[PDB]
Each structure stands twice: as C-alpha cells, then as structure tokens.
Amino acid sequence: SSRPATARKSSGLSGTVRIPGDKSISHRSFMFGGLASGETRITGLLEGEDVINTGKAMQAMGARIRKEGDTWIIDGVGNGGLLAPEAPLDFGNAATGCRLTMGLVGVYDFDSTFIGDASLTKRPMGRVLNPLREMGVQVKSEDGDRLPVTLRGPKTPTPITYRVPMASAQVKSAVLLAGLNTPGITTVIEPIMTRDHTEKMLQGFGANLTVETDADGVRTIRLEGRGKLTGQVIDVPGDPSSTAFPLVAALLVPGSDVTILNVLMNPTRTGLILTLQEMGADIEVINPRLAGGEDVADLRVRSSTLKGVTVPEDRAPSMIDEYPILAVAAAFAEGATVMNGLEELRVKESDRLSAVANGLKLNGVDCDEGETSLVVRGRPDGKGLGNASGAAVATHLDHRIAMSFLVMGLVSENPVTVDDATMIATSFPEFMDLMAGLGAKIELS
Numbered sequence: 001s002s003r004p005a006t007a008r009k010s011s012g013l014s015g016t017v018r019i020p021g022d023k024s025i026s027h028r029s030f031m032f033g034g035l036a037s038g039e040t041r042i043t044g045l046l047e048g049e050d051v052i053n054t055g056k057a058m059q060a061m062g063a064r065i066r067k068e069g070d071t072w073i074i075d076g077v078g079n080g081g082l083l084a085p086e087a088p089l090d091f092g093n094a095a096t097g098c099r100l101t102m103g104l105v106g107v108y109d110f111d112s113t114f115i116g117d118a119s120l121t122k123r124p125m126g127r128v129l130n131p132l133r134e135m136g137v138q139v140k141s142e143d144g145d146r147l148p149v150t151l152r153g154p155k156t157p158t159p160i161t162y163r164v165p166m167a168s169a170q171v172k173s174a175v176l177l178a179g180l181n182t183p184g185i186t187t188v189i190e191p192i193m194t195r196d197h198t199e200k201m202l203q204g205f206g207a208n209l210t211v212e213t214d215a216d217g218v219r220t221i222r223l224e225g226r227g228k229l230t231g232q233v234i235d236v237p238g239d240p241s242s243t244a245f246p247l248v249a250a251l252l253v254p255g256s257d258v259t260i261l262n263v264l265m266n267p268t269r270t271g272l273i274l275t276l277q278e279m280g281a282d283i284e285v286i287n288p289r290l291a292g293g294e295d296v297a298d299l300r301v302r303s304s305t306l307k308g309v310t311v312p313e314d315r316a317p318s319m320i321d322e323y324p325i326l327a328v329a330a331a332f333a334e335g336a337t338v339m340n341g342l343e344e345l346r347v348k349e350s351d352r353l354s355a356v357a358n359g360l361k362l363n364g365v366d367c368d369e370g371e372t373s374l375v376v377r378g379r380p381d382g383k384g385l386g387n388a389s390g391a392a393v394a395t396h397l398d399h400r401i402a403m404s405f406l407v408m409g410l411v412s413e414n415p416v417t418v419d420d421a422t423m424i425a426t427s428f429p430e431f432m433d434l435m436a437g438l439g440a441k442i443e444l445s
C-alpha cells in the first residue's frame with residue numbers, strides 16, 4: 001500500500017556525495033547491451049526498480065544479464081536476434097522502458113504484450129504506436145491507445161521518415177530502435193532537440209547513424225537498418241534529475257554547502273541549473289571532464305537567496321522532469337516565477353502540473369495553474385508555508401512529486417507530508433539515506 005513521510009525544518013545540509021547513475025542511460029545500457037553482438041560491460045548502473053524491469057524484459061527475450069562485483073555484464077543476442085517473450089513484459093512504473101521496447105520488439109514477427117502499474121496504464125502510448133503502425137506493426141490496445149498493448153510485427157517492416165509532433169525523446173528513441181530491424185533508411189526529424197542518449201549510444205555501438213542540425217536547430221537523424229551492433233564497455237554518469245533534489249535543498253536550507261560528484265552535464269539535461277543560476281543560485285561547476293563518452297562535472301552548491309524569473313517555453317525539453325523541484329524553489333524566491341509550455345507535464349507518472357499546484361496550495365503557496373503554465377510567488381523566509389495540521393500531499397504514484405515536496409519541508413516553517421514514499425525507489429532508492437547523511441530530517445511513517 002502507501003507509506004507517508006514527513007520532512008522537517010533543517011539546520012544546514014553539509015557534505016560530499018556521489019549521485020546514483022543516470023536512469024535514461026541505464027535503461028538504454030540494458031537494451032543495447034542485450035541486443036548487441038557479444039559482451040557489454042556496465043559500471044555505475046542505476047539499480048532502481050524501473051531499470052531492473054527493463055533488464056528482466058531483455059532477459060525474457062534472450063539476453064543474459066548478471067552482476068559481477070560492481071559491473072553488470074551482458075551477453076547480447078545480436079541485432080535481429082531477439083526471441084519471442086513467453087509472457088507479457090511488465091514495465092511497472094517505467095514509460096521509458098515500455099515505450100522504447102515497443103519500438104525495439106514491435107517490428108519483430110512474433111507477438112509481444114506490454115503491461116504496467118496503475119500509473120503507467122493511464123499514460124498515452126499513441127505517440128509511439130502511430131509511427132509503428134506506419135512501419136507495418138499490428139497494434140491491439142485499450143481505448144485511447146493505453147496499456148495493455150499487444151504488438152505483432154510484419155515479416156518485413158517498412159522504413160519511414162517521421163517528424164515527431166511533440167518534444168519527446170521517447171518517441172524519437174522508439175522509431176530509431178524500430179529502425180534497427182527494418183531494411184532501408186529510417187529517418188527521424190526533431191524540430192526541437194530532446195535528450196540524445198539514444199543517438200550517441202547507438203553510434204558508440206557501431207550503428208551507421210548520423211545527425212545533421214540545420215542552422216535553424218531542426219535535427220535530421222538517419223539510421224541504416226539491420227546493421228551489426230557490437231558490445232561495449234559503458235560507464236554511466238550520475239543522474240542530473242536525481243541531483244536536482246539535494247542541489248535545490250542546499251540552495252534553500254540556510255547554512256548549507258553540499259558537493260555532488262560525477263554529474264551528467266549534457267546540455268539537454270541541464271535546464272534547471274541554468275534556470276536556477278538566472279535566479280541567483282550559487283552553483284559551482286568543478287573539474288568538467290569526459291567520462292564514458294559523456295560530459296560530467298562535480299557541483300558545489302551553497303545557500304542562496306533566489307529571485308523570480310521567466311522560464312521560456314523553448315527551454316522545457318532540457319528540464320521537463322525538473323519542473324516540480326523548480327516550483328518548490330520558486331516558492332521561496334523573491335517575487336514571481338512564470339513557466340509556460342508545460343502541456344507535456346500532464347501525461348507523466350502523474351499529471352505533474354496539477355499535482356505540483358495542488359501540493360503547493362496545500363502548503364500555503366500563492367500560485368496560479370493555467371492549462372499549460374504555472375506562476376509561483378514566493379515567501380523567502382518560509383513563514384506560513386508547509387502544513388501544520390499534517391495534511392499529506394497527493395503524490396499520484398509519482399516519485400518526483402514525493403521527492404520535491406519532501407525537499408520543501410526541510411525549508412518551510414511548518415513540516416511537509418507526502419502520502420507515499422514507496423515509489424521513490426523506482427529511480428532513486430538511495431534518496432532517504434543520501435539526504436539523511438547530509439543532515440536532512442525526514443521521518444518515514
């Protein structure tokens with residue numbers, strides 16, 4: 001069932017900690033490692049529930065996965081070598097695993113079924129199912145193109161050129177993965193850049209994949225299908241979405257100085273840091289380096305006084321998952337913060353725009369929720385914020401709503417309670433221990 005947790009006002013947060021691995025890259029390490037020819041070795045893998053579910057799905061299709069010491073070792077089946085799964089592939093809470101695997105296996109000439117939890121089962125799959133239908137995949141789904149879904153690929157898939165209609169890295173990724181088992185050239189056109197882990201990693205595994213960016217920013221991504229993929233050595237960088245929680249906590253809690261090590265700094269993932277810096281945040285980028293083919297750095301974060309800012313719609317893709325924690329930081333900034341271009345927040349683990357606005361109001365914050373926007377006016381000293389009666393924020397099975405509001409309680413005059421902390425382990429099982437080590441006071445019911 002559910003397990004509520006309550007966060008209480010803290011004295012400064014202090015320490016140096018290594019953040020857990022990046023979820024986006026961890027999911028893809030299991031997928032590409034499972035598909036490629038030969039052996040793939042992975043260090044720094046995120047072992048949250050979401051990633052483990054992807055691992056079990058690849059095993060169900062023939063990949064062998066094991067953990068030796070601190071390294072995950074995978075024996076892949078080779079491109080075109082996936083085997084028909086015996087039972088439905090259960091992705092739990094993870095849309096990333098579900099949507100990417102739909103493209104990967106949907107083009108194979110055997111049936112595959114996809115299921116998930118109460119949250120995933122309400123999310124839209126049409127955005128990935130439509131291009132697959134164009135590629136010749138037969139689709140069976142519930143009303144609204146929701147799970148459960150059963151796919152059956154054609155004997156010979158059809159390559160397509162697909163312009164992604166919304167700024168989704170998962171749709172782009174699903175089409176490219178379907179392209180791996182399709183003869184000919186598959187092309188994805190992305191008018192606004194989204195996280196590029198799929199493109200970079202496929203190139204690293206040997207795929208004939210090119211990316212061309214027009215001066216106007218439009219990206220044309222071409223992949224030649226049915227080519228060989230070769231197992232690789234992968235070093236996963238720290239998760240920038242997970243980093244956001246102790247980072248914002250350190251900015252807000254007076255008397256704080258927290259350093260987070262080995263953080264992924266790919267610009268498609270750093271919109272929150274840029275936004276916080278414009279608000280006056282003291283974030284130091286230390287020893288920027290190249291690790292495992294990605295840009296990483298350590299970040300030293302210190303208590304700062306923040307001021308409201310305008311966050312443009314075009315920055316959304318580079319920080320889509322950090323809007324909840326940004327909304328909490330704004331609740332303590334001087335003045336108003338306005339964020340627009342938020343339509344995508346409504347189809348995540350929870351409708352994040354509605355869950356954030358209701359949670360902020362329950363905890364005394366002045367804010368205005370629009371169809372696709374949010375305005376927050378802060379109270380720097382935190383007085384009158386939080387909930388003295390102990391009323392719980394509804395998380396709607398969304399672990400980022402739970403983590404964002406627990407950070408708020410470390411700063412507000414009154415404690416902040418969330419109705420469920422059990423979903424935090426989907427992407428950040430280390431959260432409670434990591435925050436407690438820095439000095440945070442969070443009581444688990």
Ligand SMILES: O=C(O)C1=C[C@@H](OP(=O)(O)O)[C@@H](O)[C@H](O[C@@](OP(=O)(O)O)(C(=O)O)C(F)F)C1
Nearest residue numbers: 024094095096097167168169170171321348349
């Ligand atoms: O390809 C990826 O790795 C992701 C792409 C994005 O989705 P879109 O392509 O729809 O923009 C993120 O929002 C998603 O993160 C969440 O991913 P999951 O649903 O759990 O898998 C998250 O971590 O918060 C979010 F979508 F909920 C992970």
